[PDB]
Amino acid sequence: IYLSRLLIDTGGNPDRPRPGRKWLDNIYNVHRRLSMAFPSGLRREQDPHFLKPFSPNDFQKTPFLFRVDNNIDGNDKRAIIIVQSVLEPDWDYCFQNALDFLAAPPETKEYNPEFKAGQLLRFRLRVNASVRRHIPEMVQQDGQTIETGKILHKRVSLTWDASSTPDQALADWLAAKSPKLGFTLQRCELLQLGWVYGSKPEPKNVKVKEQGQGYWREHKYNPLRFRAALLEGVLEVDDPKLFLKTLSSGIGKAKSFGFGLLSVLPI
Amino acid sequence: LQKRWHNEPLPQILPCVMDWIPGYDGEHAPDDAEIHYDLPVSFQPPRHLPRFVIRRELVVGEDVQVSRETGTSVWRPKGTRADYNNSEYKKVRAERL
Numbered sequence: 001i002y003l004s005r006l007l008i009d010t011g012g013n014p015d016r017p018r019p020g021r022k023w024l025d026n027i028y029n030v031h032r033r034l035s036m037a038f039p040s041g042l043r044r045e046q047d048p049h050f051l052k053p054f055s056p057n058d059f060q061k062t063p064f065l066f067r068v069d070n071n072i073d074g075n076d077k078r079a080i081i082i083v084q085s086v087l088e089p090d091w092d093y094c095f096q097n098a099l100d101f102l103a104a105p106p107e108t109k110e111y112n113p114e115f116k117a118g119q120l121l122r123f124r125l126r127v128n129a130s131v132r133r134h135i136p137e138m139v140q141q142d143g144q145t146i147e148t149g150k151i152l153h154k155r156v157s158l159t160w161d162a163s164s165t166p167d168q169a170l171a172d173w174l175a176a177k178s179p180k181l182g183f184t185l186q187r188c189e190l191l192q193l194g195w196v197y198g199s200k201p202e203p204k205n206v207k208v209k210e211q212g213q214g215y216w217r218e219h220k221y222n223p224l225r226f227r228a229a230l231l232e233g234v235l236e237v238d239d240p241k242l243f244l245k246t247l248s249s250g251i252g253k254a255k256s257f258g259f260g261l262l263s264v265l266p267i
Numbered sequence: 268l269q270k271r272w273h274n275e276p277l278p279q280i281l282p283c284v285m286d287w288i289p290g291y292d293g294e295h296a297p298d299d300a301e302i303h304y305d306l307p308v309s310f311q312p313p314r315h316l317p318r319f320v321i322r323r324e325l326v327v328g329e330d331v332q333v334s335r336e337t338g339t340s341v342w343r344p345k346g347t348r349a350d351y352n353n354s355e356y357k358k359v360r361a362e363r364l
Contacts, residue, residue, distance in 0.1 A: 206358075209358070216358055216361070216362055217361070217362055218358075218361040218362070219361065219364055
């Protein structure tokens with residue numbers, strides 16, 4: 001598989017238009033752009049310069065994993081995007097009209113990861129602290145109303161006991177499912193605990209005009225909220241046929257919006 | 268009385284020329300009657316005969332009612348300036364978006 005690197009300028013003059021920095025405001029925009037970085041054959045031949053209208057059905061729907069972190073390069077702040085996929089990405093076709101998005105040209109390296117039993121890898125990982133509660137619908141109404149009755153099962157953020165710590169709680173949450181994916185954690189240090197926001201358009205059929213031919217479509221924007229937890233540590237390995245499938249896929253839900261990427265450095 | 272454009276000037280008086288009428292009361296030609304040589308008899312060796320001609324007048328508004336022109340005279344290109352406030356464009360724009 002391949003790992004790709006994108007560098008975005010975070011500092012610079014703050015009184016100028018910075019479309020590369022503004023692109024990281026919406027994570028759906030990031031996912032859509034990385035999807036546009038995967039042309040589907042005849043799209044390149046029909047549109048080499050990427051000027052015809054964008055169509056999701058004209059691009060491949062292969063999954064990929066990416067992580068957006070931040071760093072300092074000498075005396076400048078930078079945002080690094082690490083893209084892990086299974087097919088060779090084409091960053092030339094994606095940003096060819098948006099060369100000002102990236103401060104530095106993209107990079108790509110072939111990854112051939114395999115580790116037999118006895119490797120103490122150093123890992124970094126940003127998970128989505130999500131859980132499906134059995135009773136997540138109390139219907140806490142607002143205003144004058146405070147308590148009405150309905151029940152449904154929904155995904156919400158992970159919660160911890162008031163007498164415990166978030167670090168230990170997330171450590172045992174990761175260790176509880178850990179033998180299924182094939183690793184043992186020695187140290188688990190919590191580095192961040194926050195949210196990830198985004199917006200998504202959805203077509204809506206307002207009334208048909210004179211021969212509207214399938215209603216009049218109007219965009220309506222719906223929000224997207226995720227609870228993110230970034231953590232590093234040291235982990236061993238066992239059953240490498242399971243760890244390779246763990247590396248190929250992600251960990252936790254919402255894998256298509258920056259979560260689940262496991263970064264491992266051999267030691 | 269047909270008109271052609273909006274500010275078309277009009278006459279208040281419409282002179283008219285009529286053939287004289289017999290009837291044996293005024294059997295003789297009146298004093299205000301002129302003579303015109305427009306009574307045709309033959310055309311290839313053209314032959315014309317005198318005819319007594321009388322003159323009268325008419326006034327617009329009491330005998331003839333002024334009409335109005337039809338259609339459009341002055342032609343201009345369409346040249347529709349685009350508008351971004353009416354409902355049809357506001358729906359077409361969302362449909363395109």
